[PDB]
Amino acid sequence: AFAVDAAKAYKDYLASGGQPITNCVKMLCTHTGTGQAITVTPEANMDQESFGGASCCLYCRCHIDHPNPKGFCDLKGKYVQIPTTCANDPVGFTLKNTVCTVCGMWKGYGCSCDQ
Amino acid sequence: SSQAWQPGVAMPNLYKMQRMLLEKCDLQNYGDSATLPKGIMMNVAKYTQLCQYLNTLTLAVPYNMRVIHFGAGSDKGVAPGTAVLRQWLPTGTLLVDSDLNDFVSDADSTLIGDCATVHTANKWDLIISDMYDPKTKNVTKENDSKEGFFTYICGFIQQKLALGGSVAIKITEHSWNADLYKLMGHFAWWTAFVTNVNASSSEAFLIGCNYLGKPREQIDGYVMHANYIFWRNTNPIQLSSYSLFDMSKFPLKLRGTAVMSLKEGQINDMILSLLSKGRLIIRENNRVVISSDVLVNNEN
Ligand SMILES: Nc1ncnc2c1c(I)cn2[C@@H]1O[C@H](CO)[C@@H](O)[C@H]1O
Ligand SMILES: [Zn+2]
Ligand SMILES: [Zn+2]
Description:
Chain A: Residues 1-115 form the ExoN/MTase coactivator domain. The complex is a heterodimer. By secondary structure, chain A is of the alpha+beta class. Chain A has one domain. Chain A is 19% helix and 10% strand. Chain A contains three helices and three strands. By secondary structure, chain B is α/β, with parallel strands linked by helices. Chain B has one domain. In chain B, helix 7 (269-276) links the parallel strand 10 (258-260) and strand 11 (280-282). At the A-B interface, loops of A face helix 2 and helix 3 of B. Bound molecules: ligand 5ID and zinc ion (2 copies).
């Protein structure tokens, strides 16, 4: 079957110098949270921004089916923590990275499990 | 000030008691804009301040709380206000939102269409509306009570707001409804709340606190809106984002308020007192079921 590869398209578009998706919904919070990647309430630490999840989901924002047989969205209804250094492109960040299934931190941005 | 360190300013009781005539609204800081924290949307700041204020009221906060949010979309296609509400509300709160125009949301369920098409089987503990038509801001025409979605909201409150529940409905100088003010008299308490980040606007949130299902007070909505405008016209509010920087006590406390199903004959004065204190919600505790009417038409 033919299916649009939306993730590859955004990644290629970024590399080509396209402006990252904007209007991701950044939350006010204490910035004293756990720092885990995807949480039921904002959990940014001092090095992170917390965003409304739907607004950082490429599939939600571009009105395309989620890459999941169930069509279930990982981010909608939750909050995603983005390193402040990457918060200019929360959608790119969530797309290009992965959450540790053990500690819940972003691999390489908080996960200390291979230490 | 004092005021500048609050999330905003609530209409002083003495203004509510006046009998003013409706005048044009001329705000001294009409052109000012608040300096928002870096990267924060106006609607996030505004809803944060609204919720900070609601934290000071006697809201009923049951388990299995149900909240519906009208006017939740944006020209950007996202729902900043819903995102703040879901952060504020206890985890597990059922949150439904809606807007005329399509948008993506963190709500548990979203309905796209005119709010007049929306129906729910269940009652609600909190109703938030940011609905607004900017075509109402027409300074060249008389400022009469508006109908449209305000007519829907008034009926929706009377039919589907649990006793003990509360509302926050956005108004402006020109976006208002007299019956909605009159319905504020059916709550234990009410105010018009102006956020400090948006204090240069005639916007306010008309807040009804603890619904009683009957009038506690007879309010003339035409006069009351005139009273609101008179307050705004004579009380410049200093733009302020100070409260946004202190989010430590932001989440709404899950009070576990009691929910009972009761028939009208059972609502005695002791129940009414409990309702008025934020200590009771009266409604079915059944499933939340919603729908939107869809008009079917041909083009061929
Ligand atoms: N009758 C309606 N039913 C539902 N939503 C409504 C309306 C009207 I009139 C306006 N809006 C929504 O209000 C948002 C703020 O202007 C906007 O997002 C706008 O779309
Ligand atoms: Zn999604
Ligand atoms: Zn890990």
